[PDB]
Design a protein around this ligand. Structure first.
Ligand code: NA
Ligand code: NA
Ligand code: NA
Ligand code: NA
Lengths: 372, 372
């Protein structure tokens, strides 16, 4: 069976996890601190905070910017539900903007006009674009637009650790940036995430919120404010630390698999039967999602692929189609691209233990299905 | 060095964690489901949900009962900050009631009069007592009082998995019960927690909130509501599953260490120099906390113990002393017992790898310090 995802925990990491469990040094320790340092250096960013999961990173980002009831945050239509959900878990309203058919990322023009026509009643406080599947495209434009309208930028870089927007690493352009280490993401810690920022106050506040308002004082730990628990275990941090130095190389290889997919599938694209993703420079290829033409029923294609020993799945959700984000601004609107990607987007296997021969099998199976 | 805490991960668990990491089956899986079943059977309760940490269990309990802005929840003065913090993270107000000097648990009489004199403006919705250090005492009274005033009961049983109130397991009397698997708690998963309930709607709602509103529908996963991510990893669940069948036996042994402490220290108690905890039937002895007489400066005692090769620490915090929970009801009040325990409570080593000879050393060192 060719799998969509096959999480890769280096044997070194496995042995280190065993040492930690045996010695009983379990809670956020030197291991988390080191991971944070190592992430910050990898990204070229001032501060990193590792946390329970990528949702927790987005949540702490929101809480650190004091976003909640009476506020609004713009999210993309195409993403995982967590993006829009976590905004509304704070009491703010998720304001949906459609994505671009080429990049699967928030459409920068539709973003700008959404801000221009914003009529309240909530105060628009932030933009939360997704660098979907590892695609950096649009990030500098989001920064530009955010600054123009005096809004915070929160990068939902869940899928995009090690993605690069030209000269600048994804996650380091927003006021804060958020990563997931969920098993389908390329670096995993089972569950895990990271919140990053070049801003000291945002860092210090999120750090308080991550662990019950705790900080080191003159005579030990002081409780400075109300907070949560979104700490990551020491042994989860160790897993992360062992993968990070391999991550760039993993991404290079994934870009090579993408090339092989592009090779095999370009005729089908040219025949108007599918659309391929544009793997720009700096795309980390967390997911390789094609778009089936309307002619094809994705559920049937998936079943046929499965019979031929190939896993596949939808890429992400349409936030408008979920019917959970009920601000007037969303219901009065018609989304085009996200709902389309939701129904016809197809993720194909792409990971660390896929080779040319596998991709060839995948591509031949898809071809026969689509040309029947 | 005699340590306060020495987390015990069975070698079986270590090998199983290694198998899970190597096979790449990481996200909440059969392992979490099995742990939940095994917890529910251990407790004699209908539903269990494992989660990121004990704070997350309290949070989901609050959110499932729809407690937030405009609401109030009664918490004990003596506890870990998370108890009161997580109430206020929902927008509700933490209303503090003092504890009993004998049990370190919410004083049931002061609880009743706090309800009787409650004058708003918020709606009192719940009581969140702590079964502090594994002490079940008071639990049936909390249930009685909650029912009398039509309030929800949320047991903060962070420290009390395997504690028993007569015939009934701690955690199973509240509308919901919450456990921590933090490293200092007897069963640890590094970080981890569990939310339990005999109520189906509370269970189903918390289960939605734990993972982005997700549920199994006709054609796979449906997104029914807004939620969070408080999932526990599969490999953390495995650790838990390996410890649970040993837990009763661990508790029996801790009660034996308590006996040895009581033996050695009763003269000092009788001389009015310390007060010992009452280890009632069903006390799980997560912590063995004595109270120093006012004569003694706990910081100095701790330093002296440390020089003599013995770790020790404060037991918990006073929520009133933190000055974070600013409802009128709390500031207009004077707390007696919690602030005292906060300043003079001293936790002594008690865990799975402490023996009679260690306790003897601890007790002799403490004696010499206190009798100087
Ligand atoms: Na060990
Ligand atoms: Na619509
Ligand atoms: Na492996
Ligand atoms: Na006071």
């Amino acid at each position: 069976m060719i799998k969509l995802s096959q999480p890769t925990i280096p044997e070194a990491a496995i042995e280190r996890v065993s040492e930690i469990l045996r010695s009983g040094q379990l809670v956020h320790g030197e291991e988390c601190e080191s991971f944070e340092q190592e992430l910050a250096s990898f990204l070229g960013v001032k501060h990193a905070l590792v946390v329970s999961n990528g949702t927790a990173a987005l949540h702490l980002a929101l809480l650190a910017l004091d976003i909640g009831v009476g506020d609004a945050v713009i999210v993309p239509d195409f993403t995982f539900a967590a993006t829009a959900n976590i905004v509304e878990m704070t009491g703010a309203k998720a304001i949906i903007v459609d994505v671009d058919i080429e990049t699967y990322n928030m459409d920068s023009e539709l973003l700008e006009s959404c801000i221009q026509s914003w009529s309240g009643p909530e105060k628009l406080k932030a933009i939360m674009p997704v660098l979907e599947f590892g695609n950096p495209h649009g990030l500098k434009k989001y920064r530009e637009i955010a600054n123009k309208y005096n809004l915070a930028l929160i990068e939902d870089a869940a899928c995009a650790l090690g993605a690069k927007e030209q000269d600048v690493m994804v996650g380091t352009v927003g006021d804060m940036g958020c990563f997931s280490f969920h098993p389908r993401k390329t670096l995993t810690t089972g569950e895990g995430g990271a919140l990053v920022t070049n801003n000291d106050q945002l860092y210090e506040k999120a750090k308080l919120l991550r662990s019950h308002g705790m900080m080191r004082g003159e005579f030990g730990i002081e409780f400075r404010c109300i907070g949560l628990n979104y700490r990551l275990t020491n042994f989860q941090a160790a897993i992360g630390r062992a993968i990070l130095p391999k991550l760039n190389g993993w991404i290079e290889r994934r870009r090579e698999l993408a090339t092989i997919y592009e090779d095999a599938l370009a005729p089908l694209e040219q025949q108007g039967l599918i659309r391929l993703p544009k793997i720009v420079e700096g795309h980390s290829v967390q997911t390789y999602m094609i778009v089936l033409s309307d002619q094809f029923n994705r559920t049937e294609v998936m079943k046929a692929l499965k019979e031929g020993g190939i896993e596949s799945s939808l890429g992400a959700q349409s936030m408008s189609e979920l019917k959970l984000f009920n601000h007037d601004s969303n219901t009065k609107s018609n989304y085009i691209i996200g709902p389309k990607l939701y129904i016809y987007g197809l993720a194909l296997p792409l990971h660390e233990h896929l080779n040319i021969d596998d991709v060839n099998k995948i591509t031949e199976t898809l071809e026969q299905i689509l040309l029947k």
